[PDB]
Amino acid sequence: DKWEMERTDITMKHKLGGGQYGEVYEGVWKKYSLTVAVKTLKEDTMEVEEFLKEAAVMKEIKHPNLVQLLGVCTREPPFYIITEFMTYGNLLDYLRECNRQEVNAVVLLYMATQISSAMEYLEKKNFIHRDLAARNCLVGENHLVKVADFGLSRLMTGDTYTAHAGAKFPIKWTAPESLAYNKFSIKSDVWAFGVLLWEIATYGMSPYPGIDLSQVYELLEKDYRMERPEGCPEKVYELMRACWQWNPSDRPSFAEIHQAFETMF
Numbered sequence: 451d452k453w454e455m456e457r458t459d460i461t462m463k464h465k466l467g468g469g470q471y472g473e474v475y476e477g478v479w480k481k482y483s484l485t486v487a488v489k490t491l492k493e494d495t496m497e498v499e500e501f502l503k504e505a506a507v508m509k510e511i512k513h514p515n516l517v518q519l520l521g522v523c524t525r526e527p528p529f530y531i532i533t534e535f536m537t538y539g540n541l542l543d544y545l546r547e548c549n550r551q552e553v554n555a556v557v558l559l560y561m562a563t564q565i566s567s568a569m570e571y572l573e574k575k576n577f578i579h580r581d582l583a584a585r586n587c588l589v590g591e592n593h594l595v596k597v598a599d600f601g602l603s604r605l606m607t608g609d610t611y612t613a614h615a616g617a618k619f620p621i622k623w624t625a626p627e628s629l630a631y632n633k634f635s636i637k638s639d640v641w642a643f644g645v646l647l648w649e650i651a652t653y654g655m656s657p658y659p660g661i662d663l664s665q666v667y668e669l670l671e672k673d674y675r676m677e678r679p680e681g682c683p684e685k686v687y688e689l690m691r692a693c694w695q696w697n698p699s700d701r702p703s704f705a706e707i708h709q710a711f712e713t714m715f
């Protein structure tokens with residue numbers, strides 16, 4: 451394939467995490483001695499086409515801030531998708547446990563710009579992530595951040611519309627039109643990017659502080675939004691707010707969001 455490889459070139463170690471379906475384990479590709487991350491599905495998780503669709507899309511992606519595909523075991527079960535191992539783990543715990551003087555507002559801003567560049571790229575490809583949030587972002591050396599997905603992906607491309615059975619979307623990151631009418635697009639990924647910008651600014655606080663899940667949409671619909679986090683620059687907050695525009699089409703594209711970061715500065 452170019453990508454095909456085989457197990458027992460790989461030692462499977464412990465879990466790193468997973469999502470509604472899919473579990474990711476740390477492992478070693480013995481030969482080239484590299485520690486790697488390998489996603490698997492379960493014995494009776496009948497989501498083959500979904501897993502295959504994730505592997506297929508990943509082969510089309512080449513960007514410095516999108517986790518790197520190394521290979522795949524798709525000729526026979528168990529099927530594996532193998533990517534590089536990101537030394538610092540997920541962005542959400544990184545933020546919650548970090549030395550803030552070292553991970554300061556400027557580093558938060560650079561982290562945001564790197565995610566925005568990954569997204570603009572997905573956007574050119576017409577790929578929709580569908581679960582963008584800090585817990586799905588990963589951290590390498592020297593604050594390097596990359597977008598990834600610990601769950602069996604629910605991505606959608608310009609040719610696909612499927613998802614694994616009972617796919618549930620986290621209310622606090624999911625755009626209104628997506629929750630209420632199941633309408634997903636690049637623009638819903640832009641809404642999620644706004645919430646992630648908010649996670650980054652607050653060092654990984656849980657969104658919509660002081661509101662029950664049951665009121666989130668209703669308040670959104672009445673024009674309430676999360677407030678500017680302490681120390682978050684106004685232009686960064688403005689960008690969050692534009693991402694949270696009610697009408698999907700009034701949200702900026704990822705190309706505009708990246709440009710705004712470039713010209714802030």
Ligand SMILES: CCCc1ccc(NC(=O)c2ccccc2NCc2ccc(=O)[nH]c2)cc1C(F)(F)F
Pocket residue numbers: 466474486487488489504507508511516517531532533534535536537539572577578579588597598599600603605606
């Ligand atoms: C539009 C495409 C979106 C997309 C979907 C799926 C993946 N799939 C992974 O992210 C992935 C695949 C296989 C194994 C692990 C893994 N990541 C988790 C991890 C954890 C620790 C660790 O060390 N490494 C990886 C990515 C994307 C992407 F990147 F485009 F956004």
